[model samples]
Target: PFDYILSGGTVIDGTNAPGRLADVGVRGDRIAAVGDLSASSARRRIDVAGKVVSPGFIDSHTHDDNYLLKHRDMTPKISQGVTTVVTGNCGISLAPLAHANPPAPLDLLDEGGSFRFARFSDYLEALRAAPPAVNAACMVGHSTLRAAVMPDLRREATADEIQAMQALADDALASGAIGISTGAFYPPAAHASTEEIIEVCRPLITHGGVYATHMRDEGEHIVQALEETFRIGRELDVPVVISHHKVMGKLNFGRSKETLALIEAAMASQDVSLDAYPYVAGSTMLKQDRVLLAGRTLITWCKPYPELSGRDLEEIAAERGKSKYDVVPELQPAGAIYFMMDEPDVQRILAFGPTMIGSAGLPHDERPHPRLWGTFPRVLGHYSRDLGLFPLETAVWKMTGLTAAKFGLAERGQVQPGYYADLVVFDPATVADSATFEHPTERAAGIHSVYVNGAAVWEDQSFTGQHAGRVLNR
Candidate 1:
């Protein structure tokens, strides 16, 4: 008998194709049939009439490197129909890290004492021994490399430092990391020159690895930033993925039009892709400059003053009889959501052909940004079905097929025979994100079931405690 049969669902297939009524047959860890499987015998049959069955959503951008081990259930992600997450984004990864006390963005992956892996292989070994409920593909981080080799982060690397970092990156890529990422926008890597970035990513080209970056600037200088990103990719001879592509701050709210255009032009010559979250607001740890620009902000978490979490920054500053800047320094190593991008810019980027959907959610935040739990459904329900931003098929493609292809994840991101049986069943009519900035932990509505590698890990709005994930590599 076959292992499972999901009967009577409309299969979207993750190719942006029109939905067709199909019966999917799963045999062991892969899909065996995608149409007319009613005659086949099965150990179990699931009635999924009136639901949309798609390749399980892949979260292309994430910082879930430590969260997978800490909270193996990964409720915030799995409940939203995400079956795979690409980690080590924005130049912060848990592995290849030990000391340096890190900094604002790098420390966002974990607090002190969590940086256990001295080598990329060590991290992969631990993950393979105890897999999370969802599959993970990892990238070596540029900021992490800088922190490991540099005595101080405020200066450029010497020839020896560059060679040392390249050696580590080569070893990590050999250990199965898909690529490397840079966070030049972050303080640690801000001083790195374009030639320095090019030299650092040289190892990736020969290994078929990619270059992903959180650009140095996203405000008034976004055009210059985009050009620098393209230059590095062009010089390195590797595909480029612009991490969480956005126009930050109110002043540059509509600049995505120009940024995407630049990316489009670059794509005409080289392989280029980008990811974006649904919200106009962006979240990260506190900085003095960020505090000054953020006219309105919400505290996501606080180490020194954990009591004030989920409150308005201005409100807290007012109660303390000080300016926001004066109070922000007290919230060192904390997180906040800055209302930055314009809604039209968000819609424009999400509709673009090569753009993938990534929540960019911080799993460790106490009052996390709602995107962590709400992103996929908001795109599926509010943006696609309710608001008609695009067809449900296109939405699934952004989260699944497009992302899988970009990351070189084999045998996933599609619901077809010969593909891994990773799938999600959801109601198109009622699906919506319940998580809000005010209440960021709520689960989304209308996801009926999810499967990873032919085993059901989520169903009936609850986790089944099944850990069928593996460490995916290029």
Candidate 2:
């Protein structure tokens, strides 16, 4: 007898295929069968009438490295039908970081006390001892390597420093890091040359790992950025992932056409993949110079003054009888949501066939961006079903099959037999994102049940407090 069976559901197998009625049987932690299982016996069964049963979503990008330990229940992601998250994106990872005060964007991962692990394997060991609610794949950060070895992050690394970073990258891959990521634009990596990135990512080629980057630029210089990303992958002979691909600022509104073309052309010779969120705005650490170009900005978190959490920067400046410039200094280190992308540009990237969806949600934000809770549902409901952006199967494909294949996640991202029983059952018609910029913490609507490794961590819109997640190694 099977452990559980879901009956009479419209199965969208995460392959861009049309939905078909079927009953799925689960045994142990894997799917036992996917055809008619009425003749089969099960200890438990679910009647999933008028709902979609597809492979669980894989969040191709995220920053939940610390949240995996801090809030292991993973309400935000598990509630969104995301069974797996690819963390350590944008060149930030929690472990292998020993510095007490990590730089600006690196601080986006976590602050003091949370940076506990001094080695990559040490971090993985903690996860094994007390697993979270959803599966995870990690990447070692290039900036974290800099923080570990370099005395200052303001200039280029010497040949000796580059070799030291490479040694650390090698250790991380041996210990289960899926790849290495670089945020060359962040203050810590601002002066890092393309040569340095190539050297840091060298270990990936031998380890069958990927080279991912939060490219050096995203505005007027985006084309140059794409070329640099392509070169790193091409020279290193490794798969490449461009994290959260977007064109920022008014001056660069419609340039995705050129960038995508560059990516498309480069793909013929290299293995390239990209991820994006549904929202037009983007969020990250607060920077005075960067905020000036963003059309409108909201403070996601303020270290110096946490009380001003959800307020707009403009409003905060007004209350103090000062300009936005003056208020910026007072809030020494912070995070913000920048409304900088055009709606058309966002939709264009979504329509691109190879693009995957990643929430890029900073779970630590006091008033986090809504993408944390709403990304997958928004793509499935708002873009695909409601807005006619793409078919529901296509949306599922991007979040599931495509993502799994890109990341080399084995035995997951499908509803087929012998695969891990990571599944989601939801009402297709009623599924939608309820979270917004003003009220960003609300749970999504229409997610009925979420299973990870054959256990119901979330059911009927509530967590069962079951921690079935595993740390996946590439």
State how far residue 367 of model 1 sits from its true place (Å): 0.6
Cα deviation at 294, candidate 1, in Å, is 2.9
Model 1 ranges off by over 4 Å = 290-292
Write down the worst ten-residue block by lDDT for model 2: 286-295
| Tens digits of lDDT, candidate 2, 227-303 | 99998888999999999999998888898898889989988988999999999998988877653334788898888
What are the lDDT scores of the predictions, listed in order? Answer: 0.89, 0.90
Q: How many residue pairs clash in each candidate?
A: 0, 0
Clashing pairs in 2: none
Candidate RMSDs in order: 1.3, 1.3
Candidate 2 residues lying further than 4 Å off, grouped into runs, are: 290-292, 318-326
Residue 197 in candidate 1 has what lDDT? 84
